[PDB]
Amino acid sequence: MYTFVVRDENSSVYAEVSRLLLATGQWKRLRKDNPRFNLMLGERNRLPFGRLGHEPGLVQLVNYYRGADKLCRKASLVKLIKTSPELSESCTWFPESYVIYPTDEREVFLAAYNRRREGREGNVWIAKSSAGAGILISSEASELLDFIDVHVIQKYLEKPLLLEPGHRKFDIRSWVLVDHLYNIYLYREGVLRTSSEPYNSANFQDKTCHLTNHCIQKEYSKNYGRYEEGNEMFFEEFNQYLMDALNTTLENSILLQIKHIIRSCLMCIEPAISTKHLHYQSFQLFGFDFMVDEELKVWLIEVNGAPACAQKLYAELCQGIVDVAISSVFPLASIFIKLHH
């Protein structure tokens, strides 16, 4: 029988994974501080990677990639994209971003700002960080810097794709699972976290229509759950909309770019986080968030290292985590799209 430990009680994804492992009759849960475990569902912060893989006779597997924070942090992601030749400063699927401290890029951020200002081009930027629930969307550069006083300022996409009816904004969440062999598996099921308020490009102060966060829409939005249950549209409905409205499919217009973006980000950090020849193995579930503009071009917003799933999809995905990431290492007695590379 296999053994595992749970060190993150707030994880709804792995709370379900733990519930599934026990139901198999072949896995046993130990105390959180018992070192003789086959599998660790580790804590979010300061996971002791240095103590893994030193137990004779135990193949040890952890549910986090040491070093994957570079991709799953606002400032880290921007630095990684600008400085990595594989992604390059000429990257076409990541909004123009700059790291601003309250090194620093204050002067380079203002240089590009002025260029847009003189060119009469739209000059709307968004300031955010990894310490949010708090964001500020302003068209004047002076307002952005004063608010910060680590943060990142990136170009706010002024021309998003708007779902009709509603004339509303949305973002696409994709769940990606990387196993110990560094196979990249894209969950076939995504979710569009849509705004129930019509997109108002005039006043960016009313964030109920500009921020597609599920929490913001459930508290600050007057039309929560009006068009779809929980402001969550799944791929079946979204694909049918693209066919009826835009005369295209989700696969061709959006999904190709998403799969391309997932490969580029994950392949970029593979040499730094791969556990191929390491004394312990790793897998991890990621939450990629994308924006789609009116030209049907996909933009990467951020990557989540400890994402939560949609209520309707917890069963399928969590079962998929056991089959692909856990049973592959500890066999007992496809819902994923394998992104080859």
Binding site: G50, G53, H54, P56, P271, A272, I273, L278, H279
Partner: protein
């Protein structure tokens, strides 16, 4: 020329030292009776090999080494082994009863009674030296003598030889071969009192050597003989610069200068390649690029850890065999584009390279196959702090319940030395994190 004195303390140190001196003789052409045909200066000289070997009028080359163990069974094997003729009785020091895996027993109780004798036997060897550099101290972390008596010896050496350098070869405890539950105690206790007296220490984790033996030599259940023959290869590659003509790491002071910019952070990581089994007739000889690339695989390190999640302060490459600088630079260039190698900002991103044309010598009948070229990388990376974390965690688990503490207090050690030693390790882990993250 400046002499170097080797001191071997406890079972681990003695058996490892015996393996090293066996290899030294094979490398320098010294026969078991101490005779060296190639040495034309009979009964003296200031050649490079003289830093480790003295000479008698009869032409015998005697290791500048002292063996110390509180129990005679291990040192008695040296008195009757293949190289018994190399050493004279004054070099082998044994007691009646050991430290029973008790740091306090080796340091205080038994150490106080034999320290003056050991220093006397060391003083004799020093009197033969015209310009003593310092000492190389071999010992284990987990044994009562290797940990307890070594720290007392290191303290006294700083007193009697204030200006001399001292390097360590220390065996990190591994449960797969360990023989005591309290080895985390002894490891942290000896590291606390030895930290300020050691200029450079090369930690070898028995776990790493054990798995390298099982995986690369096909040994199902490696023994100390298997482990020590491999360890002596590593040690030989590290000391080769002191025993042969060259310009890199030519004296003990240079080890600290090239590998230890911060004094407390003086534990360089050792990586060795290639380790090939002798039980196969032919094996495709590895190139300079392949063995150099292997120096960045955790599976080849003397301590399992991930240098990718740390920072380098220095990095030396010690080649032995058919290697020319051109191939080294080409291999390094390729490795930089593929590997995650981050240095501290205040340090230059570079590699100090040493090449000895004589390929590695293998013990006839041993497990290691002869190779055309080998390399040992000495890199000072913060990633080695992972070994401190593992050790400190096990320490915390037992000491929270005061488990086994009475054995140490019963030998005259105060319970406060436990927390005092643990607090020093806490500052050590904090130093590594500040430097590397």
């Amino acid at each position: 020329m400046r002499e170097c004195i080797s001191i071997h303390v406890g079972q681990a140190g003695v058996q490892i030292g015996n393996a090293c001196w066996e290899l030294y003789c094979l490398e320098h052409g010294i026969q078991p009776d101490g005779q060296m045909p190639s040495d034309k200066t009979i009964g003296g000289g200031d050649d490079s090999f003289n830093t480790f070997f003295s000479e008698t009028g009869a032409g015998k080359h005697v290791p500048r080494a002292v063996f110390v163990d509180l129990e005679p069974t291990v040192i008695d094997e040296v008195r009757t082994g293949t190289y018994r003729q190399l050493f004279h009785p004054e070099q082998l020091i044994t007691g009646k009863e050991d430290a029973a895996n008790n740091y306090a027993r080796g340091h205080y109780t038994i150490g106080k009674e034999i320290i003056d004798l050991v220093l006397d036997r060391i003083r004799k060897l020093a009197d033969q030296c015209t310009g003593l550099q310092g000492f190389l101290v071999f010992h284990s972390f987990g044994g009562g003598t290797g940990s307890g008596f070594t720290s007392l010896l290191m303290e006294r050496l700083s007193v009697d030889y204030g200006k001399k350098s001292k390097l360590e070869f220390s065996i990190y405890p591994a449960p797969q071969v360990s023989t005591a539950v309290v080895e985390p105690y002894n490891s942290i206790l000896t590291t606390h009192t030895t930290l300020e007296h050691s200029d450079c220490a090369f930690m070898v984790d028995n776990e790493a050597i054990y798995d390298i033996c099982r995986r690369n030599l096909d040994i199902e259940r490696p023994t100390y003989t298997n482990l020590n023959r491999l360890i002596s290869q590593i040690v030989s590659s590290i000391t080769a610069s002191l025993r042969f003509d060259g310009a890199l790491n030519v004296d003990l002071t240079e080890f600290q200068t090239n590998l230890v910019p911060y004094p407390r952070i003086h534990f360089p990581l050792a990586t060795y390649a290639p380790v090939i089994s002798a039980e196969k007739a032919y094996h495709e000889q590895l190139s300079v690029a392949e063995i150099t690339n292997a120096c960045f695989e955790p599976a080849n390190q003397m301590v399992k850890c991930d240098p990718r999640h740390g920072k380098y302060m220095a990095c030396c490459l010690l080649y032995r065999g058919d290697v020319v600088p051109k191939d080294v630079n080409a291999a390094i260039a390729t490795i930089k584009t593929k590997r995650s190698i981050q240095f501290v900002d205040w340090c230059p991103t570079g590699f100090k390279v040493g090449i000895n044309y004589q390929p590695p010598t293998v013990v006839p009948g041993g497990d290691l196959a002869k190779v055309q070229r080998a390399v040992c990388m000495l890199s000072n990376t913060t990633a080695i702090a992972e070994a401190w974390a593992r050790l400190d965690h096990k320490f915390d688990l037992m000491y929270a319940k005061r488990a086994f503490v009475h054995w140490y207090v019963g030998e005259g050690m105060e319970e406060g030395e436990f927390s005092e030693a643990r607090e020093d390790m806490a500052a050590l882990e904090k130093d590594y994190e500040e430097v590397g993250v």
